[PDB]
Amino acid sequence: GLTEEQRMMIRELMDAQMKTFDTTFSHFKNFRLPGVAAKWSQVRKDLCSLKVSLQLRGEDGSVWNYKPPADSGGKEIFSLLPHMADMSTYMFKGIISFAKVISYFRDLPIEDQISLLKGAAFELCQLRFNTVFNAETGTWECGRLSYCLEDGFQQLLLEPMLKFHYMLKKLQLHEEEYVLMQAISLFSPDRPGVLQHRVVDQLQEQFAITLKSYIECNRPQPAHRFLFLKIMAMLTELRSINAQHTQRLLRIQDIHPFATPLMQELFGITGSL
Template structure:
């Protein structure tokens, strides 16, 4: 290090109230009860207390600590008799050090770098403990508005589901047709064993049923053959179900003040982009990660039911991995609704014109979610929850595209999809 850098470093340290080592350097510090000003016994500057056994200023405290750690020998350019003052204390380091030693400053009181860092971390933890993270009144209001909107528009008892056209399970699913392990609600629970820990990262895993002797290519051929002659017996029920759920999402969005404040064209674009993702979040709240069953009040759905509606493995394998991974996070209702709102207010949806407004809303929601986790969660790994939720939101984007493709394919084979769903997945922005 050059002389100029050393000098600048020393001057900055002397100006800093913490000097080279802060107040965690192992020095003895005492505060006098009276108001009489104290002076540094080395240079005469204003003292900040006892450091390394002597009354000194922050500058001389830092100098002594550095000098004791510096291996180089200090030499006086004059006659080893320099008078050290506030104004000239940096001119002769040798005499300044001798003055420090003569007034009783002790090298053994200097803490090691490791001890200093440990003490700093203790102070940091203490401050964090004393100042817990809390939600602001504005964030509390946002969460309450979302919860109210969600509870008004989404019935967790699913009582309305019995009014839909009946769920017909007579038709074989592709898994039964192709000879794969049966995955219905009546099968062994091992067929629904959750995927590995990293399932959330493997959004494009189209071959998760690796236990099957069929290759993915042969399975795809089986699906094509099945699709040609299939009657999707579950499709009427799922059409009614999807229409009902989409209306709930629209009503949920219209209840939010920040959504209503947008122009109608942007409202439509955001709904088209996010509705299918919000439906995934809704169904995750009803998913049993032990059995692999969606428990919807009076009705229960398994993977075969979804297959009987015409959906194929390119969507269903990642979807199952998604549901296991998200459900494993055991989100609070507040976290679920914030996740829905973050998905809704995505400024990069096709057709959105006021990107900045939507982006600010999403930023507000994301920060609220992060603060909620910090304030309300107690588990040690809570700092990992926010990025995991963000990863799930990203994963839903991939499934959204594949879902759209499969709906259009099913509609070509058996035109029973609801006009509302077809409108949601249409490319037009209005």
């Protein structure tokens, strides 16, 4: 029940997703691993919000498992930051590649392309991570790497990022709906520095209309009443989570540098003290 324009739009997004989302993480390699005054108090609270163990399954069948330390007043809270920076960077590269495939995106001026990616890279990363999230085990399954939430569940949903992943996974979205959420997030006209606000706003509206129509044509079930509005509310929440985590990372970065050059570029860090 979609127009030909809407069908081609979804096709171009799915194509970009297929080409740029390495769902097995096969090419995530050479990453770092944890080694074998009121600022610090808040950096202490900032880091304890995402507490995961790490599993690495080798091709040979071997398994390495890392359990993180407890917070005990020292630098041990930073042990996983280089690894997560390498992951973030790998994911960001895929997101940048995704955007550059999309015709609606490459037709924007280069300055707006950069402003949009700076604004949304983190959000599209989280949308992709949600598709590998296992809500039954509290684990993001990234091919041969697994990230498992330390253990109750009601106390984990207090952290906005974790509640987001559980609540989004519960909607049981299709691949097509995930990629339309990525586009809606990517084409946000009100990111800092955007100049073609009107063109970007018009593109975002078309992506949201496509998503609304996709759901109407393919989801008649009572469980999916208001699904479009639930998705748009999650995107609003994702934007809030994005803002929280940008401030959170800039605080950590300020006392304990860890951002890769790509992250610095995305977060506006110039390289000068």
